[PDB]
Amino acid sequence: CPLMVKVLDAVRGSPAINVAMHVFRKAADDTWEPFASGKTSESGELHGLTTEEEFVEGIYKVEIDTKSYWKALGISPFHEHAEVVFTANDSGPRRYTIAALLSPYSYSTTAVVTNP
Amino acid sequence: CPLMVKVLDAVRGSPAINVAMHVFRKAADDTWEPFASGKTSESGELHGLTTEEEFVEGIYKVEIDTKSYWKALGISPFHEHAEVVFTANDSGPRRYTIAALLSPYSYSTTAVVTN
Amino acid sequence: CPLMVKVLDAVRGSPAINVAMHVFRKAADDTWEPFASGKTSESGELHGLTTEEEFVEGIYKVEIDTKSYWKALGISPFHEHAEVVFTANDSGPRRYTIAALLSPYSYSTTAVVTNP
Amino acid sequence: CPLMVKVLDAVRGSPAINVAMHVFRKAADDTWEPFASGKTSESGELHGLTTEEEFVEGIYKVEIDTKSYWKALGISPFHEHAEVVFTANDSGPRRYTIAALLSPYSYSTTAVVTN
Numbered sequence: 001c002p003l004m005v006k007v008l009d010a011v012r013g014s015p016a017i018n019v020a021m022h023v024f025r026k027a028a029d030d031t032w033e034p035f036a037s038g039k040t041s042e043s044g045e046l047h048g049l050t051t052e053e054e055f056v057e058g059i060y061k062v063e064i065d066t067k068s069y070w071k072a073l074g075i076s077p078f079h080e081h082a083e084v085v086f087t088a089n090d091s092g093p094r095r096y097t098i099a100a101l102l103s104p105y106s107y108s109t110t111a112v113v114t115n116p
Numbered sequence: 117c118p119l120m121v122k123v124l125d126a127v128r129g130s131p132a133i134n135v136a137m138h139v140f141r142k143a144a145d146d147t148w149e150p151f152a153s154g155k156t157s158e159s160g161e162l163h164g165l166t167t168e169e170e171f172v173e174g175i176y177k178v179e180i181d182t183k184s185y186w187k188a189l190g191i192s193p194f195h196e197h198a199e200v201v202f203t204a205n206d207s208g209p210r211r212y213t214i215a216a217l218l219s220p221y222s223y224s225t226t227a228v229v230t231n
Numbered sequence: 232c233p234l235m236v237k238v239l240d241a242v243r244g245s246p247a248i249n250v251a252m253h254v255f256r257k258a259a260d261d262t263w264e265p266f267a268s269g270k271t272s273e274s275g276e277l278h279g280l281t282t283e284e285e286f287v288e289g290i291y292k293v294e295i296d297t298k299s300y301w302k303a304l305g306i307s308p309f310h311e312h313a314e315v316v317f318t319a320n321d322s323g324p325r326r327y328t329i330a331a332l333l334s335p336y337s338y339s340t341t342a343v344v345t346n347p
Numbered sequence: 348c349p350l351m352v353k354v355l356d357a358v359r360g361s362p363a364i365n366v367a368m369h370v371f372r373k374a375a376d377d378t379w380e381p382f383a384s385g386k387t388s389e390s391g392e393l394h395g396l397t398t399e400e401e402f403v404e405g406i407y408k409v410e411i412d413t414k415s416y417w418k419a420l421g422i423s424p425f426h427e428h429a430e431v432v433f434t435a436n437d438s439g440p441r442r443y444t445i446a447a448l449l450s451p452y453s454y455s456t457t458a459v460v461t462n
């Protein structure tokens with residue numbers, strides 16, 4: 001797939017399982033339209049969000065629900081969620097992996113962009 | 117100040133200077149109400165965003181304009197900006213330092229919350 | 232395999248390819264004995280360093296040659312190398328993924344530990 | 348000081364206090380020669396490790412005892428310690444701030460190098 005998200009937990013040394021996330025695309029009128037959503041698997045990965053044909057140029061936002069993740073583990077974290085906002089496919093189609101590492105008071109995100 | 121932001125550049129090993137950011141508080145209708153902004157100093161810090169009287173409990177967003185920063189350096193960045201969204205003061209006023217580390221395809225944010 | 236290393240580049244948004252690393256194990260006399268070595272593939276991964284039978288309890292050190300990586304890209308980085316030192320298999324065999332994200336003046340490392 | 352270390356705790360959102368560290372310089376025979384040490388203050392900082400006269404070019408290692416830190420908190424950590432190895436002063440003396448962020452299974456280090 002053209003868009004994959006991988007989430008790790010830095011406190012437990014594990015994938016971050018069952019993390020909900022919502023993906024949005026910026027519409028012509030500048031509002032965020034819902035695009036896709038899902039939750040991470042046992043390997044901390046979310047696959048199958050979109051297709052090469054559907055995933056056209058645009059500005060996309062991945063909102064990762066890190067707060068609910070930590071709350072379910074008994075932890076009151078700093079962030080409400082983690083956000084990744086980026087322009088996709090501006091120079092033709094690419095494949096995007098969004099990776100996030102989570103701690104209660106910190107998060108780090110990186111992107112791997114590969115040419116099909 | 118109850119709220120300070122510090123921005124660092126991981127490519128150059130320096131404070132990230134002249135980085136613009138806006139701070140928003142979530143309104144009753146779920147919309148983001150702007151209330152403070154500024155740009156980072158020569159030490160990569162932005163102070164004086166708010167006061168303890170004004171900085172009441174609520175959900176706050178800091179939107180850091182990282183894209184403009186990398187553009188000014190001639191480096192093509194991945195992100196449109198970096199956001200930090202958090203609930204403040206859940207059990208009394210705290211001093212918040214939000215630190216952001218920037219790379220062209222990555223960013224990290226950490227909070228130091230003291231009493 | 233019981234030990235895998237994955238390295239990403241935060242400047243280029245890519246796996247970190249051809250990164251050399253050496254793995255050591257602490258001997259009875261407290262010296263670091265060479266254990267395994269290799270370099271990352273096109274996917275930024277190093278597999279096949281050891282086997283479940285060879286990878287006994289002990290303290291291990293993974294030394295990742297980040298300086299040569301950056302130098303080959305024209306960059307003079309801060310760190311000489313990135314080190315990960317840990318006790319492995321203290322409570323029975325586990326599988327270990329060591330993940331590193333690299334920038335010229337920063338590096339971050341995390342571990343995913345899974346029970347076979 | 349030409350060299351300062353700052354340690355932060357990503358589980359608790361605080362300075363990591365009373366964290367022990369040792370600093371080494373690489374000797375002619377490729378061995379690590381200890382020369383400075385200390386533990387972090389209430390603000391998670393360790394200052395006064397060296398002077399500009401003493402802090403000559405060379406390869407330096409800071410070994411931070413993160414395992415003892417997590418043990419004191421009753422948390423089982425992954426790493427034996429966190430190391431930072433770097434060449435100093437390659438083109439004149441710089442002030443170095445090394446910042447380390449700690450989680451039980453992760454650590455990150457960043458350098459801010461100023462003139």
Ligand SMILES: COc1cc(C[C@@H](C)[C@H](C)Cc2ccc(O)c(OC)c2)ccc1O
Nearest residue numbers: 108215217224337338339446447448455457
């Ligand atoms: C709050 O004060 C500071 C914070 C920081 C942030 C620093 C401790 C970390 C390494 C920034 C960071 C956060 C998360 C990461 O994954 C990360 O990886 C490089 C780096 C630097 C200097 C400071 O004076």
Ligand SMILES: COc1cc(C[C@@H](C)[C@H](C)Cc2ccc(O)c(OC)c2)ccc1O
Nearest residue numbers: 097099100101108112330331332339340341
């Ligand atoms: C290339 O896509 C992948 C990346 C990864 C690694 C990914 C989870 C990175 C290393 C996670 C990460 C994100 C931000 C960080 O600061 C970090 O520090 C080690 C680690 C695993 C599987 C993949 O298919």
